[PDB]
Design an enzyme around this catalytic site. Structure first.
Site, PDB file in Angstrom:
ATOM      1  N   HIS A  52      74.452 -39.243 -10.225  1.00  0.00           N
ATOM      2  CA  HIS A  52      74.696 -37.815 -10.418  1.00  0.00           C
ATOM      3  C   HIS A  52      73.631 -37.249 -11.340  1.00  0.00           C
ATOM      4  O   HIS A  52      73.186 -37.918 -12.272  1.00  0.00           O
ATOM      5  CB  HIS A  52      76.047 -37.542 -11.078  1.00  0.00           C
ATOM      6  CG  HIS A  52      77.224 -38.065 -10.320  1.00  0.00           C
ATOM      7  ND1 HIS A  52      77.590 -39.391 -10.336  1.00  0.00           N
ATOM      8  CD2 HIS A  52      78.146 -37.427  -9.560  1.00  0.00           C
ATOM      9  CE1 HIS A  52      78.677 -39.555  -9.598  1.00  0.00           C
ATOM     10  NE2 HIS A  52      79.027 -38.380  -9.112  1.00  0.00           N
ATOM     11  N   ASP A  55      74.353 -37.942 -14.900  1.00  0.00           N
ATOM     12  CA  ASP A  55      74.349 -39.341 -15.328  1.00  0.00           C
ATOM     13  C   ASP A  55      73.104 -39.676 -16.142  1.00  0.00           C
ATOM     14  O   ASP A  55      73.146 -40.546 -17.019  1.00  0.00           O
ATOM     15  CB  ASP A  55      74.421 -40.280 -14.128  1.00  0.00           C
ATOM     16  CG  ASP A  55      75.777 -40.292 -13.465  1.00  0.00           C
ATOM     17  OD1 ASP A  55      76.773 -39.947 -14.129  1.00  0.00           O
ATOM     18  OD2 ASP A  55      75.835 -40.681 -12.276  1.00  0.00           O
ATOM     19  N   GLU A 176      81.692 -36.999   1.214  1.00  0.00           N
ATOM     20  CA  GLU A 176      82.539 -38.101   0.778  1.00  0.00           C
ATOM     21  C   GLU A 176      83.993 -37.656   0.818  1.00  0.00           C
ATOM     22  O   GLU A 176      84.408 -36.863  -0.038  1.00  0.00           O
ATOM     23  CB  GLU A 176      82.147 -38.522  -0.631  1.00  0.00           C
ATOM     24  CG  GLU A 176      82.894 -39.721  -1.169  1.00  0.00           C
ATOM     25  CD  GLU A 176      82.427 -40.099  -2.558  1.00  0.00           C
ATOM     26  OE1 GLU A 176      81.206 -40.066  -2.818  1.00  0.00           O
ATOM     27  OE2 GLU A 176      83.295 -40.415  -3.403  1.00  0.00           O
ATOM     28  N   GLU A 212      84.370 -44.094   1.571  1.00  0.00           N
ATOM     29  CA  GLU A 212      84.609 -45.040   0.493  1.00  0.00           C
ATOM     30  C   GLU A 212      85.828 -45.878   0.830  1.00  0.00           C
ATOM     31  O   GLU A 212      86.888 -45.322   1.141  1.00  0.00           O
ATOM     32  CB  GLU A 212      84.831 -44.331  -0.843  1.00  0.00           C
ATOM     33  CG  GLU A 212      84.968 -45.296  -1.988  1.00  0.00           C
ATOM     34  CD  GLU A 212      84.717 -44.641  -3.322  1.00  0.00           C
ATOM     35  OE1 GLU A 212      83.720 -43.906  -3.430  1.00  0.00           O
ATOM     36  OE2 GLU A 212      85.522 -44.838  -4.252  1.00  0.00           O
ATOM     37  N   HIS A 215      89.077 -44.861  -0.850  1.00  0.00           N
ATOM     38  CA  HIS A 215      89.584 -43.522  -0.561  1.00  0.00           C
ATOM     39  C   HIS A 215      90.443 -43.499   0.697  1.00  0.00           C
ATOM     40  O   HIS A 215      91.552 -42.950   0.684  1.00  0.00           O
ATOM     41  CB  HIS A 215      88.420 -42.536  -0.427  1.00  0.00           C
ATOM     42  CG  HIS A 215      87.706 -42.265  -1.712  1.00  0.00           C
ATOM     43  ND1 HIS A 215      86.673 -41.350  -1.805  1.00  0.00           N
ATOM     44  CD2 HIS A 215      87.869 -42.777  -2.956  1.00  0.00           C
ATOM     45  CE1 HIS A 215      86.242 -41.306  -3.053  1.00  0.00           C
ATOM     46  NE2 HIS A 215      86.940 -42.170  -3.770  1.00  0.00           N
ATOM     47  N   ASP A 240      80.356 -46.348   0.552  1.00  0.00           N
ATOM     48  CA  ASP A 240      80.717 -46.708  -0.813  1.00  0.00           C
ATOM     49  C   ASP A 240      81.717 -47.855  -0.758  1.00  0.00           C
ATOM     50  O   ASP A 240      82.816 -47.711  -0.205  1.00  0.00           O
ATOM     51  CB  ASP A 240      81.307 -45.525  -1.582  1.00  0.00           C
ATOM     52  CG  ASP A 240      80.244 -44.641  -2.228  1.00  0.00           C
ATOM     53  OD1 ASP A 240      79.058 -44.995  -2.199  1.00  0.00           O
ATOM     54  OD2 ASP A 240      80.608 -43.585  -2.781  1.00  0.00           O
ATOM     55  N   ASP A 252      89.004 -48.386  -7.938  1.00  0.00           N
ATOM     56  CA  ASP A 252      87.575 -48.711  -8.065  1.00  0.00           C
ATOM     57  C   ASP A 252      87.368 -50.175  -8.434  1.00  0.00           C
ATOM     58  O   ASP A 252      86.606 -50.504  -9.342  1.00  0.00           O
ATOM     59  CB  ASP A 252      86.876 -47.805  -9.083  1.00  0.00           C
ATOM     60  CG  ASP A 252      86.707 -46.386  -8.587  1.00  0.00           C
ATOM     61  OD1 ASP A 252      86.460 -46.208  -7.385  1.00  0.00           O
ATOM     62  OD2 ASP A 252      86.834 -45.445  -9.398  1.00  0.00           O
TER      63      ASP A 252
HETATM   64 MG   LIG Z   1      82.373 -42.733  -4.196  1.00  0.00          MG
HETATM   65 MG   LIG Z   2      87.041 -43.887  -6.136  1.00  0.00          MG
END
Ligand SMILES: [Mg+2]
Ligand SMILES: [Mg+2]
Ligand SMILES: [Mg+2]
Ligand SMILES: [Mg+2]
Ligand SMILES: [Mg+2]
Ligand SMILES: [Mg+2]
Ligand SMILES: [Mg+2]
Ligand SMILES: [Mg+2]
Lengths: 379, 379, 379, 379
Positions: A52, A55, A176, A212, A215, A240, A252
């Site tokens: 990002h 970041d 995403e 992802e 997700h 992802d 995650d």
């Molecule tokens: Mg992601």
């Molecule tokens: Mg996540």
């Protein structure tokens, strides 16, 4: 099971750099210098890093100095930047949405913020740009008319796509999907909803998906099936990888450490399809883990992927598996249902004895067991 | 709260006619003559009825005699048939799929079965035909390559769409998404996945959706948001109303009796959008319920819809609600983010003070509470 | 990976004998003679078989003749009957519940039906009797006052427990929790709720649990944690092994074929705890599968268990794993928090520097990765 | 629908004082002075307030000065403190657990922290003390042996219970179950698991439950059924009211604004049972909401409860509803299945014609519809 450049493994700066402040507790790790992340990831065999815009500022608040230190690290290591994205979710002004805030001045701020990082991404050679609409949505049905929110979502994405075309950046966009969290419901909640949305875009050709693992699994959906549909529509522009234990908060976890069986079949599909995109990890080391544990967890993502890759390669190469697949008549699904020169009356001239065929078996028990035995390394 | 023809309420024969044999027990009600269903539904104020091809045979095994008795009932009552569909899921030959069975002869059987009922649907004046791919999918990832299954799914739907065009039937197709059950995962599991699939069809213009309240809720998704996206893409060709208590087996409760708050906002959206499609109920009376209870439960669907309709009409008409909506700046979402004559440099010439605006509130607490108080009939 | 008598593998007659009639389709396999099941299971290395009372009648409607043929098969093979149970869910009279039907005459019928099969179970040497309250519950909150339903549930279980004590049958009862399906919600929906209920029973000492992998997973709960609590309370009287892909309909997959990682840690816990109960499988072969596939799927349950057992044995035996566990300080959890001679003031005399300790790591990344690598057979 | 002292409404300081920092963004509201919360809640008709020990420090870091300002506000308003609890989850030292940290020195720190706040709670007159084990659990099965963790959990709770008995504080303990978040799985994940755990405690008599609407709903469980079991075991010592939209992150919505139908039946059960505990709200105003919105959302909790209370009172008072209940034979569930002087042979002397009774209906359709119509204020 050592990672190589051809494996195209990459990590976001925000993954190993996550401070592990959650809904109920303080950060447990200090801010991580992106320069150190680039060196540590390179040493572990990662091929690339993503970011990002914000970041880059984790330890250096001056944006120009932070960009310069990042690029110096990338120069020294040969790490590539295949993709970049925008933080449209941390700052309080995005509390109601970014592209779909009710407030027009917030929507325009969001667009300008993306444009600045599109500019930086192109200079770094990122040819894919990721959009996670994490604040786009609502906690209650009265708060957001989704038809009008999608008008504004489409407007922002098409506007930005025309911008990158005008600049000749040659990049593609990757949306995403995520079903919920931080919003009660997020717009474009699944791979499917994003595909349907993309097809309404003026610039649809250059927009695809960044699905992802965790997700889709938060909605209980089959990630392998969703990736299959993304591949089938030629819209898998990014992926992802992580782990998740079904419908709950976004966990995650390390890839392969949630639904391991699904991860096995995901690797099988990515490899067998010949998809050439990067294998990107979007994960968090864990709130129990210290600064040294972080690199163990980064290595664990790549190692788990590589083990599953070998297991899936051995699975498909096994004559016993190819025999089981033929018993299931799997290959017959590839034969078109209708022949090239076949009319409606030609089809209705043929009859089918459904009662003679009612007891056919498909013998998935054998194929399923060979798959599991291969995953567990017992074949 | 008495139903009128303009309410366009309709029921499938298989709903009130369900015998209530479940995974763990025998049927509790005897087969119901479709002729009786047509008369009882007409008496209750239903406007229409729909059917699977094989529903007509519930008490009469001779297909010609069953069709004749059905049409006679429709003649006597003035009940309309707005839609029809195919049973591609009961017979054992479909155990691996219908359009996506591995066995080519089963795929061709499925297509021919639909073509026969397309012929009958047109004669009855059904202008929408529903496809629920209930057997299309798998219980394990090894059993079905979804890319190849979607090749065959697309092939079947486009073939059938060309057939109805050749016959000049003027009908549209409505794909019914469902995430799972009876298959471990079903192809096109959500509104989104079906929209993405439709956009790849040669005959995409005449194919849309038949979303079902309980199906999206089985995946934890927001049905109101999904219907909003369907409306936004002009693909809401049919709707199936019932109730569901989140991710579990398909419950098929009376509409409004699962997530009542979501049902309130669904009715609000259907009515406020001016969508003119039929309000179709796909529900089961319940295994505890006898033959007389069945008609109580049918009436309950229409009555609950009508009460929610009045509550939503009063909600939007309330000056207090319109005042709360303005406080939330809801109407400002309709203002385009970008002006008609605005260039990229025009946009980047404007700046936004994000720190001055970080404490803006959106006041959804008031609007949310007025919505709930209106639903509960207290305003 | 060949099963042995010490593995104590067993199957219910209703598992391999399931005809695969689901909510949306007809049976795909013919009724299976229990005599054939006993011989085929014995040949595959199963140690035991279990049954519902009415399972014995699958091909023989005369109960006395069906019992005699069953016992003859058990004589010839040496197959054991460790447990039995009652069908209180198929017959329409149980549509509102069995022990918790509103109708008192139905409740008394249920009790008498169990008493007859308790009598038969004792003669066969079953020392554990399973209760799955599959019809106990409701689809709506108005339909069933759960306080009063639990009065009747407790009354039935305690009454039956006193009966077996009067007969000196020496058996224990195992309550099988399930969160939903066929009822919208089932009473005693989890391992926890059944434990709390058991503690109110007069005959609590002889009542424990029969937890099922897929049932706790339908509620998203951690089956390994639940079994840990069952073991901790000394209430694991029976276990049902299968697979499930999270919150959806009850899938009854082959053990290890749903959440494989959880299955690995379940086997690790069962083996390491030294639990001596039977490893019972409650699964369905699958609707795609024919009569021959059935025995492949039965073998697959035992083989998957045995592979996971070897992987878990190797995991714990690995010096690298024992080293990782020490780094995590796992063994320190076994040290009592409070010393034997320690008073409140002794405890409050000691202080803890929480700021000096805030950056401690627990290094689960390494242990987690060694666990996954062992499961995948790569160590 | 104005709240009165007899309604016993109360709020935690951490609810209206939540700053709305989530997993993906910064705080949107400034720290709220507990003194202001006590005055604003009193003005709105709240009867009481509760607190974590560290909540008192939101604007005043000196603990003695923070306690004094809190007590002064309580003096001026007459607000009561019915319950208190401990923050064992924010500080990094609890990252692996508090009572079940691997590190013994952390476990002892946790116990001492609770003892200090037990002392303060007693002085304020709190007679119930809440335990939410939010850090007790794990993200992976290898990280935490739950049998040993429960040894340490039991040890801590029994130790603290003996402490309050030695001090003659006259208080009861309320364990708050939660299935997950912030941990991948939390120990004692449901009402049931906590009840089973409580029954193993030496001090079981003084330990009960603090169930939270949204927590059981995160596992898809029926909150009304769980509260019914808690009441049935006489273990409802506290309750936490809010809203939740099924299995996802903990949403903490206004009570009644998630599953409204379940909230209606919860209020019906609390009121009809005569439970005399406080109606405590554990909710968050929402990240979109400003300082003024906060008090709107607090009022909304009490108003929604009061509206549902009136709807449920009218429901039960309606002769049509009492007639429907009799048709369902609901009252017959209260008749004991077995008579006082009835032997086993007396029971087996009676027979039941199950075939004559197979078509009985239970007529829940009517009762269900009257319930929904009453909730919606249409009766
Ligand atoms: Mg992601
Ligand atoms: Mg996540
Ligand atoms: Mg359905
Ligand atoms: Mg439907
Ligand atoms: Mg099951
Ligand atoms: Mg079972
Ligand atoms: Mg909560
Ligand atoms: Mg709480």
């Amino acid at each position: 099971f050592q990672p190589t450049p051809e494996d195209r493994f990459c990590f976001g700066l925000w993954t190993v750099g996550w401070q592990e402040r959650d809904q109920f507790g303080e950060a447990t790790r200090a801010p991580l210098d992106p320069v150190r992340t680039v060196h540590k990831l390179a040493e572990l065999g990662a091929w690339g890093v993503t970011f990002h815009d914000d970041d880059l500022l984790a330890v250096e608040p001056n944006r120009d100095a932070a960009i310069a230190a990042f690029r110096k690290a990338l120069d020294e290591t040969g790490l590539v930047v295949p993709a970049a994205t925008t933080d449209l979710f941390k700052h309080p002004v995005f509390k109601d949405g970014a592209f779909t805030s009710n407030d027009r001045d917030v929507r325009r701020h969001a667009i300008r913020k993306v444009m600045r990082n599109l500019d930086l991404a192109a200079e770094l050679g990122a040819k894919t740009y990721v959009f996670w609409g994490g604040r786009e949505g609502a906690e209650s049905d009265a708060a957001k008319d989704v038809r009008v929110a999608l008008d504004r979502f489409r407007e922002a994405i098409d506007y930005l796509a025309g911008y990158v075309k005008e600049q000749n950046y040659g990049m593609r966009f990757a949306l995403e999907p995520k079903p919920n969290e931080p919003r009660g419901d997020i717009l474009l909640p699944t791979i499917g909803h994003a595909l349907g949305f993309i097809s309404t875009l003026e610039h649809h050709e250059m927009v695809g998906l960044n699905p992802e693992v965790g997700h889709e699994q938060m909605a209980g959906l089959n990630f392998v099936h969703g990736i299959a549909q993304a591949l089938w529509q030629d819209k898998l522009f990014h992926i992802d990888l992580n782990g998740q234990h079904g419908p709950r908060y976004d966990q995650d976890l390390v890839f392969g450490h949630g639904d391991t069986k699904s991860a096995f079949f995901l690797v099988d599909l990515l490899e067998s399809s010949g998809w050439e995109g990067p294998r990107h990890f979007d994960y968090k080391p864990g709130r129990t883990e210290d600064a040294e544990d972080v690199w163990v967890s980064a290595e664990a993502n790549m190692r788990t992927y590589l083990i599953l890759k070998e297991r899936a390669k051995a699975f498909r190469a096994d004559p016993e598996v190819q025999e089981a697949m033929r018993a299931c008549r799997i290959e017959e699904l590839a034969v078109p249902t209708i022949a090239a020169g076949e009319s409606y009356e030609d089809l209705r001239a043929e009859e089918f004895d459904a009662e003679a065929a009612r007891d056919r078996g498909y013998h998935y028990s054998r194929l399923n067991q060979l798959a599991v035995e291969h995953m567990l390394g017992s074949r």
